[PDB]
Amino acid sequence: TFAKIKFSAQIRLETGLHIGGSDAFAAIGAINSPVIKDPITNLPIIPGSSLKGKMRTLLAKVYNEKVAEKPSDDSDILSRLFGNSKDKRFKMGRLIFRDAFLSNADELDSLGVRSYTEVKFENTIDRITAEANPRQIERAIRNSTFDFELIYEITDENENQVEEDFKVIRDGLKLLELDYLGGSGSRGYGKVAFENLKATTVFGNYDVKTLNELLTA
Template identity: 50%
Template sequence: MFGKLEISGCIESLTGLHIGGGSQFAAIGAVDSVVVKDIDDDLPMIPGSSLKGKLRSLLSKQFSDGELPKEHNSDADVVKRLFGHTDKSGPKTGRVYFSDIFMSKESRDRLENEDIDATEVKFENTISRLTGVANPRQIERAVKGMKYHMSLIYNIENENEIEEDFKTLKTAFQLLKYDYLGAAGSRGYGRVDIHDLDVKKLVVSDEAKISSILENCKSILKEV
């Protein structure tokens, strides 16, 4: 059996979220580090690459006794087949495709109806222990309480490994809920909740087989 499944869900920010929008020239008094935004509406977004990288690093540590392997090819097999790796024949694409994640309509409406700004500026200050000199800076964050609609594509390559792959993804989502997304997690940024996860078939080669597998996958993700 081969085909594609969609994994959808909600990523909700529990604290301010900072995923940097790249290094830019900042005039004196301007924000030093801005967040990445959707070019169409200038609202904060979560790049698919940010979510993919975070989930992979969490799983890599989980399956390597807490130590992050120095090379992607040293990851556990269950991680490599989901996120990709390289072998003697060349690069191998992972089974999960990540898309950029945009703010939900619910949160967009809330911003408009309650006249809330989508981002805030947090003032921070570091002080040199040697000189005592302060280094103030301004960090832009997407405000807490916003919801982002996540949609991932899972490519079926081995029907006997589908449920194991979904259990691995469940572990990744659970780990992320108790970690952080983006930057400055040790300073309170980036705590998120993941909920309303669902799975649906997009294209499958065997309709009879997929029904029971699909229900099992939904049950697995409901435990996140």
């Protein structure tokens, strides 16, 4: 058979994140570590590439028996969810990480927000000669929230591995909450919560009753 089921979630930032960004034509005084933004609404983005990238390497401390040293040395539970290139069966693997977009921009006008990002001064202090080294790095503001879709393929090759993979998906989402998703991270800048963990089938026929009881539990 064939089915595709869709993990929805709502990413709430805490001490909001800095997924580092684009522009070289910036300024002499203004934001010099820009954040990645939508080119059309200029709202901050969590790209799905960084979500998948943190999620692999946080799941790979846990799900690799032998140490990685490369992707395509992951342990056939991460090769099937994130793809290898060098397994014949695990190349397109089973998970699509869409880019998260800023959802509550109207809620963050009822709170007194001038702009949906903030600029934060950060200052390398030298420990001899005490000279300072300032910088203005941008980050999305704290109570920003994001739509989060993550699509999963269930073919016949997902014979009985759907539940075993959803353990890994809800293990990786709770493991990103213990870590930081891009940016400085050791200096704040990271802490992400996932609310409303909800899986629905978008194609095919599959039961999402028993799926939403290792998500919300």
